[PDB]
Enzyme design. Structure first.
Site, PDB file in Angstrom:
ATOM      1  N   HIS A  78      95.751  82.744  46.749  1.00  0.00           N
ATOM      2  CA  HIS A  78      95.567  83.166  48.137  1.00  0.00           C
ATOM      3  C   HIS A  78      94.515  82.307  48.862  1.00  0.00           C
ATOM      4  CE1 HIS A  78      97.825  86.879  46.870  1.00  0.00           C
ATOM      5  NE2 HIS A  78      98.384  86.621  48.037  1.00  0.00           N
ATOM      6  N   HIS A 118      97.535  84.939  58.255  1.00  0.00           N
ATOM      7  CA  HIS A 118      97.809  86.252  57.612  1.00  0.00           C
ATOM      8  C   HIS A 118      97.048  86.618  56.332  1.00  0.00           C
ATOM      9  CE1 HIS A 118     100.508  84.196  54.750  1.00  0.00           C
ATOM     10  NE2 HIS A 118     100.360  85.287  54.020  1.00  0.00           N
ATOM     11  N   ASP A 119      96.391  85.649  55.701  1.00  0.00           N
ATOM     12  CA  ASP A 119      95.597  85.932  54.509  1.00  0.00           C
ATOM     13  C   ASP A 119      94.154  85.471  54.675  1.00  0.00           C
ATOM     14  OD1 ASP A 119      97.160  87.390  52.746  1.00  0.00           O
ATOM     15  OD2 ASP A 119      98.142  85.665  51.876  1.00  0.00           O
ATOM     16  N   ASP A 221     106.214  84.536  53.603  1.00  0.00           N
ATOM     17  CA  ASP A 221     105.085  84.861  52.748  1.00  0.00           C
ATOM     18  C   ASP A 221     105.452  84.701  51.278  1.00  0.00           C
ATOM     19  OD1 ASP A 221     102.560  85.703  52.038  1.00  0.00           O
ATOM     20  OD2 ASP A 221     102.822  87.787  52.623  1.00  0.00           O
TER      21      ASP A 221
HETATM   22  C1  5CO Z   1     103.567  84.955  37.549  1.00  0.00           C
HETATM   23  C2  5CO Z   1     102.355  85.846  37.816  1.00  0.00           C
HETATM   24  C3  5CO Z   1     102.784  87.300  38.064  1.00  0.00           C
HETATM   25  O1  5CO Z   1     103.725  87.310  39.184  1.00  0.00           O
HETATM   26  C4  5CO Z   1     104.000  88.565  39.625  1.00  0.00           C
HETATM   27  C5  5CO Z   1     103.924  89.664  38.771  1.00  0.00           C
HETATM   28  C6  5CO Z   1     104.175  90.941  39.265  1.00  0.00           C
HETATM   29  C7  5CO Z   1     104.564  91.107  40.591  1.00  0.00           C
HETATM   30  S1  5CO Z   1     104.854  92.692  41.265  1.00  0.00           S
HETATM   31  O2  5CO Z   1     105.643  92.605  42.540  1.00  0.00           O
HETATM   32  O3  5CO Z   1     105.598  93.534  40.264  1.00  0.00           O
HETATM   33  N1  5CO Z   1     103.261  93.224  41.529  1.00  0.00           N
HETATM   34  C8  5CO Z   1     103.181  94.678  41.787  1.00  0.00           C
HETATM   35  C9  5CO Z   1     101.719  95.111  42.026  1.00  0.00           C
HETATM   36  N2  5CO Z   1     101.159  94.398  43.194  1.00  0.00           N
HETATM   37  C10 5CO Z   1      99.746  94.782  43.332  1.00  0.00           C
HETATM   38  C11 5CO Z   1     101.214  92.961  42.915  1.00  0.00           C
HETATM   39  C12 5CO Z   1     102.665  92.502  42.681  1.00  0.00           C
HETATM   40  C13 5CO Z   1     104.545  90.030  41.447  1.00  0.00           C
HETATM   41  C14 5CO Z   1     104.380  88.758  40.949  1.00  0.00           C
HETATM   42  C15 5CO Z   1     104.454  87.741  41.878  1.00  0.00           C
HETATM   43  N3  5CO Z   1     104.139  87.993  43.156  1.00  0.00           N
HETATM   44  C16 5CO Z   1     104.178  87.027  44.079  1.00  0.00           C
HETATM   45  C17 5CO Z   1     103.853  87.453  45.512  1.00  0.00           C
HETATM   46  C18 5CO Z   1     102.327  87.467  45.715  1.00  0.00           C
HETATM   47  C19 5CO Z   1     104.495  85.717  43.698  1.00  0.00           C
HETATM   48 CL1  5CO Z   1     104.549  84.467  44.902  1.00  0.00          CL
HETATM   49  C20 5CO Z   1     104.779  85.427  42.363  1.00  0.00           C
HETATM   50  O4  5CO Z   1     105.068  84.298  41.967  1.00  0.00           O
HETATM   51  N4  5CO Z   1     104.667  86.444  41.446  1.00  0.00           N
HETATM   52 MG    MG Z   2      98.341  89.036  52.404  1.00  0.00          MG
HETATM   53 ZN    ZN Z   3     100.334  85.899  51.740  1.00  0.00          ZN
END
Ligand code: 5CO
Ligand code: MG
Ligand code: ZN
Ligand code: MG
Ligand code: MG
Ligand code: MG
Ligand code: MG
Length: 297
Positions: A78, A118-119, A221
């Site tokens: 981020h 946004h972040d 995003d």
């Molecule tokens: C590979 C590292 C782990 O990767 C993830 C693991 C879990 C989940 S989740 O949606 O289940 N988790 C639920 C709880 N919440 C707080 C946070 C999100 C998301 C990711 C994930 N998110 C993004 C968007 C930020 C990108 Cl771009 C990404 O690559 N991976």
């Molecule tokens: Mg954000």
């Molecule tokens: Zn973002």
């Protein structure tokens, strides 16, 4: 002035085509900060934003430098690069994705600024400066940071808007940044999905327009998930670094994230504009890749 401002203001801005910022498959790994800065100017330029709102070159540059400065380098994912990529995806969706023609100038202006901002001042999903004293807590703070910058002396890229235009753009910006709260996206998306499947979707309705903008924000995003495999692995690695350190459980997490959040969004977006198919495509290809990995792990 700073050295950095001087150099950026003095630089030639290569074309959209030379900068590749029109490609959904775009990547920033090999770019310097200055280069991302120039890419960002090019985005405002080709969207007609400098023109239609009489932005002064020095003010835009200072604004962008301010935005970049207010992300934290010490945060693995981020950070400015993520913000920059979100904006590049907005740009690509507007141009290559042909969404530009579905929106007003003020909406477009607001989405770009929102994407970039946004972040702002994010401290990592772990860090908990949400105290206090007790909702979209982070997003409100990102918007405050954005407004602060937009109001700083020398940084006011909206000075050229009338009050009416300005108030409207501000509201749209605020909504766009709040939209990036995944909790909002989950509450709101059902309605968006219903409209599309009932073939009811109509952008000329103010309510539905505002919902689309929200969905477009989320799409941009999360767009790392749509990138070519070698790039997505790298980004996933940054995300993991932020989540856990600030590992074969990771491929199935990515698959879960794709299933729960991403696929339906990019499917919906492609229904709205068939030229956004590349996002859906890359997201599917990445699901193959992560699934295969998960079946060995
Ligand atoms: C590979 C590292 C782990 O990767 C993830 C693991 C879990 C989940 S989740 O949606 O289940 N988790 C639920 C709880 N919440 C707080 C946070 C999100 C998301 C990711 C994930 N998110 C993004 C968007 C930020 C990108 Cl771009 C990404 O690559 N991976
Ligand atoms: Mg954000
Ligand atoms: Zn973002
Ligand atoms: Mg492409
Ligand atoms: Mg550098
Ligand atoms: Mg217009
Ligand atoms: Mg001033």
């Amino acid at each position: 002035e700073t050295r950095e401002l001087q150099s950026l203001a003095a630089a030639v801005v290569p074309s959209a085509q030379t900068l590749k910022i029109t490609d959904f498959s775009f990547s920033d790994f090999e770019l310097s900060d200055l280069e991302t800065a120039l890419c960002t100017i090019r985005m405002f330029t080709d969207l007609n934003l400098v023109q239609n709102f009489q932005m002064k070159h020095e003010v835009l540059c200072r604004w962008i430098l301010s935005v970049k400065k207010n992300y934290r380098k010490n945060v693995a994912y981020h950070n400015w690069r993520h913000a920059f990529n979100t904006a590049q995806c907005m740009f690509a969706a507007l141009k290559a994705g042909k969404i530009q023609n579905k929106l007003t100038d003020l909406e477009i202006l607001a989405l770009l600024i929102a994407a970039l901002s946004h972040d702002l001042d994010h401290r990592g999903v772990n860090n908990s400066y949400i105290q206090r004293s007790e909702h979209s807590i982070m997003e409100h703070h990102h918007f405050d940071q954005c407004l602060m910058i937009l109001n700083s002396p020398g940084n006011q890229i909206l000075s050229g808007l009338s009050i009416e235009e300005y108030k409207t753009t501000l509201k749209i910006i605020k909504q766009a940044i709040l939209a990036t709260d995944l909790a909002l996206y989950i509450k709101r998306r059902g309605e968006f999905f219903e409209l599309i499947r009932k073939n009811q979707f109509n952008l000329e309705d103010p309510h539905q327009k505002e919902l689309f903008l929200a969905m477009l924000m989320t799409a941009c995003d999360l767009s790392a998930i749509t990138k070519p495999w070698p790039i997505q692995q790298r980004i996933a690695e940054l995300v993991a670094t932020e989540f856990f350190d600030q590992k074969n459980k990771i491929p199935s997490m990515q698959v879960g994230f794709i299933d729960a959040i991403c696929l339906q969004l990019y499917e919906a977006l492609t229904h709205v504009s068939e030229d956004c198919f590349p996002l859906l495509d890359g997201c599917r290809k990445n699901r193959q890749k992560w699934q295969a990995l998960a079946e060995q792990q």
